[PDB]
From a paper:
Downregulation of KMO activity shifts the flux between the two branches of the KP toward increased KYNA formation, thus generating a neuroprotective environment. The KMO reaction is a random bi–bi mechanism proceeding through a ternary complex of KMO-bound to l-KYN and NADPH (steady-state enzymatic assays are described in Supplementary Methods) with a turnover value, kcat, of 8.2 ± 0.2 s−1 and Km values for NADPH and l-KYN of 16.9 ± 1.5 and 12.1 ± 1.4 µM, respectively. We next determined crystal structures of KMO in complex with the novel inhibitors or with l-KYN to inform the design of small-molecule inhibitors capable of penetrating the blood–brain barrier.
Although the l-KYN aromatic moiety is located adjacent to the flavin isoalloxazine ring as previously reported, an additional water molecule is present that is located directly above the flavin C4a/N5. This is accompanied by a slight tilting of the flavin isoalloxazine. Notably, l-KYN is known to stimulate KMO reduction by NADPH and other reported KMO inhibitors mimic this effect.
Numbering used by the authors: 8 to 456
């Protein structure tokens, strides 16, 4: 059985391994050069957060141990707000509930090796330009545009948030796209190993500097450096042209003054702020929803190609790897490819919609400069319900991050929990006046184990 995959990223490489291992003849085409060919170019420092959904996908693929050996454990959140050295907010009760910070390039290289070890053939420096579905032929080209045509039988679009496969499908079907732009851009910055140690930055934690309409995060690297991401509006809104935005930060010097004013405890840690600000490109964020993910039995999308989401829940890669497991499962045991692609789409679409929604919602959580007293009291009561009924009351962030519960169910159960806590806390200023056993009875009544 033959399959062509476009995009040797995270989902495309994993699905290539899973199919090749199961006897498929896999050809994988990648626009970029092979990152395993060492050059004299600058290293790639972006990292991301691997959680249970992605880890489990790697586990099934037999690659989890190799990946985790190069990942830094993040035990909890370190929230930096002015005047108060932070304390770790642990993610869970022990080190089984942690998130892993992994270098993106290293992860991609491990997956590339894994796909080839299973028998897939990978062809780099070839970007998909167009698809002729009627003649079953692809057109690819290198950076110079030197075209090259290939016959295909099954086409998997694993080619990212600006997928060319998706574009080609839109020529033969109505994808029913809903693009929702995000006002934040993002900028990568760096904290050196020396600086992070000088300022006693905890390596085994995810760090956040909330600031309302903008914020910075930092994820650790194995060498104690941190990769920092600034999230900030591209443009200053209409009824407030003075508020910060990338448009005001015309160069590295301006970025420094902005950081010294708004992130005074972080600015000293960013030695190369000016250079990194001007060198690294400002990224764009968006949510894109597709009614249609496949064309008959001929082509299917997965990962960012199928459902771009904002990065504020750290689940895009995790979702994409979950996608890859499901697609290989359906393709392996379906009656035919068309049946597989329809069943895969029907299964995954409700969950993709849910994590897209929860990711949007999580920005307020991350960027909030202070938690209202009514927020802390609900959280505290939720903690208590979790101890009495660890089988029933599980905070939504934990369901999303540390379990494989389908995203949609996690969102629905979170809704029940949110309303339960809200009514239970209203008109009570502290825990001592809340009828705790009544709350638990409501938990048991409304949340099945
Ligand atoms: C700032 C930011 C932070 C994030 N943090 C996290 C996080 O902490 N945790 C998490 O789980 N997710 C995170 N994400 C999301 C995550 O990066 C993506 O969801 C994930 O990379 C998607 O995997 P993918 O394989 O579908 O696409 P990609 O990993 O992007 O792979 C696509 C591949 O296709 C190639 N390609 C593109 N176009 C073509 C073409 N025309 N022809 C051939 N090849 C092509 C690309 O070069 C690339 O190799 C973050 C995203 C952003 C923007
Ligand atoms: Ca994400």
């Amino acid at each position: 059985r033959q399959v062509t995959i476009i995009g040797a990223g995270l989902a495309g490489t994993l699905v290539a391994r899973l199919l090749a291992r199961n006897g498929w003849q896999v050809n994988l085409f990648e626009r970029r050069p092979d990152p395993r060919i060492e050059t004299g170019a600058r290293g790639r420092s972006i990292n991301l957060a691997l959680a249970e959904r992605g880890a489990h996908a790697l586990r099934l693929a037999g690659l989890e141990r190799e990946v985790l050996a190069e990942a830094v454990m993040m035990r909890g959140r370190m929230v930096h707000v002015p005047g108060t050295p932070p304390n770790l907010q642990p993610y869970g009760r022990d080190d089984s509930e942690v998130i892993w910070s992994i270098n993106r390039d290293r992860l991609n290289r491990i997956l590339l090796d894994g796909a080839e070890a299973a028998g897939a053939s990978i062809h780099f420096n070839l970007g998909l330009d167009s698809v002729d579905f009627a003649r079953q032929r692809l057109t690819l080209s290198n950076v110079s545009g030197e075209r090259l045509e290939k016959r295909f039988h099954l086409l998997i679009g694993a080619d990212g948030c600006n997928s060319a496969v998706r574009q080609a499908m839109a020529s033969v079907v109505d994808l029913g796209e809903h693009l929702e732009t995000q006002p934040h851009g993002y900028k990568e910055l760096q904290i050196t190993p020396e600086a992070s140690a000088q300022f006693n930055l905890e390596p085994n934690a995810l760090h956040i500097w909330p600031h309302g309409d903008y914020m910075c995060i930092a994820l650790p690297n194995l060498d104690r450096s941190f990769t920092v991401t600034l999230f900030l509006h591209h443009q200053s809104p209409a009824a407030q042209p003075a508020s910060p935005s990338f448009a005001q930060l015309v160069d590295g010097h301006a970025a420094r003054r902005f950081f010294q004013r708004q992130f005074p405890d972080l600015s000293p840690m960013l030695d190369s702020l000016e250079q990194d600000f001007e060198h690294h490109p400002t990224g764009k964020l968006a949510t894109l929803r597709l009614t249609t993910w496949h064309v008959g039995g001929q082509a299917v999308l997965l990962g960012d190609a199928a459902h771009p989401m904002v990065p504020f829940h750290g689940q895009g890669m995790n979702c994409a790897l979950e996608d890859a497991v499901a697609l290989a499962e359906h393709l392996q045991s379906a009656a035919d490819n068309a049946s597989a692609l329809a069943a895969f789409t029907a299964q995954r679409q409700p969950d993709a919609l849910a994590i897209q929604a929860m990711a949007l919602e999580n920005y307020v959580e991350m960027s909030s400069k202070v938690a209202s007293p009514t927020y802390l009291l609900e959280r505290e009561l939720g903690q208590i319900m979790a101890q009495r009924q660890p089988t029933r009351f599980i905070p939504r962030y934990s369901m999303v991050t540390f379990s494989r519960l389908p995203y949609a169910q996690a969102m629905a159960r979170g809704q029940i929990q949110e309303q339960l806590l809200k009514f239970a806390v209203a008109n009570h200023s502290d825990l001592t006046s809340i009828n705790l056993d009544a709350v638990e009875h409501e938990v048991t009544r409304c949340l099945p184990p």
